[model samples]
Target: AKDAWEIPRESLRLEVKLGQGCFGECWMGTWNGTTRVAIKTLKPGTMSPEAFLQEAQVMKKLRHEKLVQLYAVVSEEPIYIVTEYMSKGSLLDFLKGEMGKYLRLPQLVDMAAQIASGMAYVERMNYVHRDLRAANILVGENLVCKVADFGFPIKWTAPEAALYGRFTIKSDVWSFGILLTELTTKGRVPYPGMVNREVLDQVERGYRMPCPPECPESLHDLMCQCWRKDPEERPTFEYLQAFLEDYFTSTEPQYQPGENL
Candidate 1:
């Protein structure tokens, strides 16, 4: 069968399996013996090839600095979706690493802005990233953050998505809030120690996660806005990006336009 992306399995030299989940497994590989890439081997039975191809189509259309780039897709047996490799790995692990200690406050905020900026583009395209979390976020060179893992489990999803099986940009905004918390807390799990049901109950009862130690009050307030029970109450990613930009400008007097984030 002819592959739409024209990426041959023969051309990919698998180096190591990066991680595995319900979707299948991802492997680090070198394409045609030159460019480094991440190859995702999607499980056949999990979803229909039509559905997977549809997703791959959208992934190919989405292009932004803060969003992972989909390079190619092998639609044949042992389906593969190839993307650019992030040198530093997931944001969650990066934050816990010793190198995370070197991040300054401005840098942290900039990372958050980059994510919001990327999501802003997604919002304009009317696409929702059902999964947006620290673990799904990849860190590339210069500590640049890119949102990954378009799929999700119920646990990290927003209330509407979890309870009613609904997903929208508003729900994504909620997840973005949680992502912000991860950055502020150096990747601490949300509602630490609480079971899934308990956390869901607390959230339904209007109890949001507490501000992490050293988290700026303004950013915390934004998180609260994103977590509003009514999905309509959440700010759009566009507004979130603008707000972050303004916040960064205010906090760092030396910050110039288009410097970072």
Candidate 2:
């Protein structure tokens, strides 16, 4: 682990400052040759040896079309994590309508399906991505939804505090539900003006986020099932995917009898 290096300026040509909300110094920047690759230089105090090792280990084995690629880690001077730059940037930014006023409902559906597919794969591997929010989802030039920033608690169980806090498959499902809301609300928080604590408190109190406009009720309901209080009740990503597949592919009509006929 060469922990000291500088990102060659050539690595990013004409870097345009995208946005500044990273907890770390890692901000979105462009690499000239390509378009937008997430340019991130590890913050000095933030990247401890243990954290670095963990990140390397976690990223090394994780490969998914829906996940951003770690192109290279510059450890020559100032360490940098060169991720596959997404031209469209974070779903958060896009939700703000940086690209347009609103995202097509079908596009959100497609993304939801893709995110579920990716999570299903991650879950099958017995990995728990503690963090799976919209900000962590990147949109590529190809319009594919890639899950980024799959965060810590690898091999983790429910956190010690049991006030509806845990890092389980169900936690991820909850995140997905919030993401679905974000997708529909054009990128607003599931509960605007509420901090993490407040949001969780509301969630614990049985509050649920609203579904996106024109979103299929069935899909939205599936998202609701994902965020249920009981993890046992939440379907696995595989099950969710299967359900969606069945719903989308089913030739059987919702009204079986002569209701609509």
Candidate 3:
């Protein structure tokens, strides 16, 4: 909203609904003539609409293959953010779909590395994603993964963020740890069968989710470090990226998803 990163509303021809979340629904749209894009509309007054617009501006400045590209904005009362369309959808759905078989330990580590790299950029800019999850990670061509959906969700929030609304890079780290579990399980829900209150209680008590089936011991250690009760103790995204690179280069066997723990 600072200035025009604007696209005229008439230029976008919405085709089909792509997905929906608490913030808004995304639609696949054709821009001008040949460009395919995703249009995400959020009704104003939903949790400080200006904040979302400001974040969209921040996201527009961010350029990375591992981060979804925000193209333009329509700053009408019902704000719409335009971004590049990811043909394959989100990482969560991708893992549950038939394509999950390719995501052995090495591939998983690679995907994690991509996410960490993108997050490292965000960290450099002093912006916290607040929401980082497998569902918010979009899959692109050749198994590329890009972080998407900046909106925060109460369920996926860190204990500090949930209890006191203290969202920071470390809080994003906590969500990344949860995302690691999702990836290791090939998209299983974190804390299965637990209600929000139960999850909150356990998290407050320092209960961390168990390592996913066949998760490497080293990777599990990293996840635990990210989930440390003290936010100050959590490693930075730079450290995470290097750690994953080292892990990928080591001589460990790829752990197939669904192998017994």
Worst 10 residues of 1 by lDDT: 252-261
Higher-lDDT candidate of 2 and 3: 3
- Per-candidate TM vs. native? 0.86, 0.75, 0.85
lDDT of each: 0.80, 0.64, 0.81
Whole-model alpha-carbon lDDT for candidate 1: 0.80
Worst lDDT 10-window in candidate 3: 251-260
Q: Which residue window of length 10 is worst by lDDT in model 2? A: 152-161
Clashes of 3: 0
lDDT of 1 at 163: 87
Candidate 2 lDDT, tens digit per residue, 161-189? 23545667777876776677777676665
Steric collisions counted per model = 0, 10, 0
Candidate 1: residue pairs that collide: none
Deviation from truth (RMSD, Å), model 3: 3.2
